[PDB]
Design an enzyme around this catalytic site. Sequence first.
Site, mmCIF file in Angstrom:
data_model
loop_
_atom_site.group_PDB
_atom_site.id
_atom_site.type_symbol
_atom_site.label_atom_id
_atom_site.label_comp_id
_atom_site.label_asym_id
_atom_site.label_seq_id
_atom_site.Cartn_x
_atom_site.Cartn_y
_atom_site.Cartn_z
ATOM 1 N N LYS A 1 -10.591 -25.263 66.836
ATOM 2 C CA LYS A 1 -11.922 -25.128 66.240
ATOM 3 C C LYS A 1 -12.834 -26.314 66.532
ATOM 4 O O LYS A 1 -14.019 -26.126 66.816
ATOM 5 C CB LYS A 1 -11.833 -24.781 64.744
ATOM 6 C CG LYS A 1 -11.007 -23.474 64.424
ATOM 7 C CD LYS A 1 -11.168 -22.301 65.462
ATOM 8 C CE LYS A 1 -9.966 -21.352 65.432
ATOM 9 N NZ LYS A 1 -9.942 -20.410 66.599
ATOM 10 N N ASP B 1 -11.816 -18.974 70.894
ATOM 11 C CA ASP B 1 -10.798 -18.712 69.885
ATOM 12 C C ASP B 1 -9.657 -19.753 69.958
ATOM 13 O O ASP B 1 -8.499 -19.445 69.634
ATOM 14 C CB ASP B 1 -10.231 -17.300 70.103
ATOM 15 C CG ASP B 1 -9.473 -16.744 68.923
ATOM 16 O OD1 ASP B 1 -9.702 -17.220 67.797
ATOM 17 O OD2 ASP B 1 -8.664 -15.814 69.127
ATOM 18 N N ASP C 1 -14.927 -16.924 67.489
ATOM 19 C CA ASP C 1 -14.162 -16.449 66.343
ATOM 20 C C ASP C 1 -14.064 -17.581 65.330
ATOM 21 O O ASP C 1 -14.217 -18.749 65.705
ATOM 22 C CB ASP C 1 -12.726 -16.067 66.762
ATOM 23 C CG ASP C 1 -11.974 -15.326 65.671
ATOM 24 O OD1 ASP C 1 -12.639 -14.700 64.807
ATOM 25 O OD2 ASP C 1 -10.717 -15.376 65.674
ATOM 26 N N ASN C 2 -13.819 -17.233 64.053
ATOM 27 C CA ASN C 2 -13.490 -18.204 63.006
ATOM 28 C C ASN C 2 -14.554 -19.224 62.698
ATOM 29 O O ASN C 2 -14.222 -20.359 62.337
ATOM 30 C CB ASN C 2 -12.169 -18.928 63.358
ATOM 31 C CG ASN C 2 -11.053 -17.995 63.711
ATOM 32 O OD1 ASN C 2 -10.500 -18.062 64.811
ATOM 33 N ND2 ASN C 2 -10.709 -17.085 62.792
ATOM 34 N N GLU D 1 -8.676 -11.985 59.871
ATOM 35 C CA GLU D 1 -7.694 -11.010 60.294
ATOM 36 C C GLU D 1 -6.662 -10.777 59.203
ATOM 37 O O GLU D 1 -6.113 -11.732 58.645
ATOM 38 C CB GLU D 1 -6.995 -11.458 61.598
ATOM 39 C CG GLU D 1 -6.438 -12.888 61.599
ATOM 40 C CD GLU D 1 -7.339 -13.946 62.215
ATOM 41 O OE1 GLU D 1 -8.580 -13.803 62.140
ATOM 42 O OE2 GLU D 1 -6.797 -14.903 62.812
HETATM 43 O O1 LIG Z 1 -6.199 -22.062 64.898
HETATM 44 C C1 LIG Z 1 -6.562 -20.963 65.296
HETATM 45 N N1 LIG Z 1 -6.713 -20.688 66.601
HETATM 46 C C2 LIG Z 1 -6.453 -21.705 67.631
HETATM 47 C C3 LIG Z 1 -4.956 -21.857 67.898
HETATM 48 C C4 LIG Z 1 -4.663 -23.042 68.814
HETATM 49 C C5 LIG Z 1 -5.276 -22.826 70.200
HETATM 50 C C6 LIG Z 1 -4.853 -23.938 71.161
HETATM 51 N N2 LIG Z 1 -5.402 -23.664 72.479
HETATM 52 C C7 LIG Z 1 -5.278 -22.487 73.144
HETATM 53 C C8 LIG Z 1 -5.860 -22.541 74.337
HETATM 54 C C9 LIG Z 1 -6.400 -23.881 74.457
HETATM 55 C C10 LIG Z 1 -7.091 -24.554 75.441
HETATM 56 N N3 LIG Z 1 -7.442 -25.786 75.249
HETATM 57 C C11 LIG Z 1 -7.172 -26.430 74.136
HETATM 58 C C12 LIG Z 1 -6.499 -25.865 73.097
HETATM 59 C C13 LIG Z 1 -6.093 -24.545 73.240
HETATM 60 C C14 LIG Z 1 -6.829 -19.897 64.303
HETATM 61 C C15 LIG Z 1 -6.470 -20.150 62.997
HETATM 62 C C16 LIG Z 1 -6.689 -19.217 62.001
HETATM 63 C C17 LIG Z 1 -6.296 -19.494 60.585
HETATM 64 C C18 LIG Z 1 -5.193 -20.275 60.269
HETATM 65 C C19 LIG Z 1 -4.869 -20.503 58.952
HETATM 66 C C20 LIG Z 1 -5.627 -19.966 57.935
HETATM 67 F F1 LIG Z 1 -5.335 -20.173 56.642
HETATM 68 C C21 LIG Z 1 -6.703 -19.195 58.261
HETATM 69 C C22 LIG Z 1 -7.057 -18.968 59.551
HETATM 70 C C23 LIG Z 1 -7.254 -17.989 62.339
HETATM 71 C C24 LIG Z 1 -7.634 -17.722 63.640
HETATM 72 O O2 LIG Z 1 -8.209 -16.537 63.935
HETATM 73 C C25 LIG Z 1 -7.430 -18.667 64.641
HETATM 74 O O3 LIG Z 1 -7.794 -18.390 65.908
HETATM 75 K K LIG Z 2 -6.248 -12.718 69.511
HETATM 76 MG MG LIG Z 3 -9.223 -16.769 65.865
#
Ligand SMILES: O=C(NCCCCCn1ccc2cnccc21)c1cc(-c2ccc(F)cc2)cc(O)c1O
Ligand SMILES: [K+]
Ligand SMILES: [Mg+2]
Length: 213
Positions: free
Chosen positions: A142, A139, A167-168, A197
Amino acid sequence: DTKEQRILRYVQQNAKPGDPQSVLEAIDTYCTQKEWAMNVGDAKGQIMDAVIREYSPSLVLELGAYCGYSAVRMARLLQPGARLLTMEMNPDYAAITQQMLNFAGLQDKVTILNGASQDLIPQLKKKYDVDTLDMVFLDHWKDRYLPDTLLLEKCGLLRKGTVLLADNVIVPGTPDFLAYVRGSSSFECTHYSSYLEYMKVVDGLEKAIYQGP
Ligand SMILES: O=C(NCCCCCn1ccc2cnccc21)c1cc(-c2ccc(F)cc2)cc(O)c1O
Ligand SMILES: [K+]
Ligand SMILES: [Mg+2]
């Protein structure tokens, strides 16, 4: 004052301490009525619960904690002694996640790992005393699902039966990860169609079970 701070405060003032179920319901209410947030959410959360219950994993690795919603969701269903390692690159999110886990009473079951997955994955064996993982919940970024899956295999962290749950895979989407696992004889894949979500937007989870090299 951030959206994550507002989510944490809402939980603290609207959920029951030590009750993970009330914590999830408080997060989902806040995100449905006040401000959208990237928690896995209740629709995909129900699929996650069904998956956790089927495999009863003893050791789970989560890539991306955010506010701790999915860590609470998974940790509340783990058997006594089972553990969750959650990797969070954002220190502000990592402090929210710890506080969320503390409030839920799940702190003894979860360990937050601070840093990037490409740096922490190679440390799992010698630093965190990990043999192999039972389940991986993806998660995070991406564009990292594929490289991190390949890195987990390189590090000897996958075993026959390791359940990857991503996820996603539709929104924002992970096209290279999906093409790879679905095309590989080393993975048995299943798609679980759901919704993004808190939105009437199609999304989904991909389950990819590792079969060995
Ligand atoms: O971007 C998402 N998640 C990732 C967030 C950044 C994680 C960074 N990070 C954390 C631990 C780690 C370890 N190593 C490297 C990097 C690391 C996300 C986005 C959407 C979304 C957004 C806009 C939209 F219009 C629709 C959907 C929905 C989701 O459910 C999501 O999860
Ligand atoms: K979560
Ligand atoms: Mg997600």
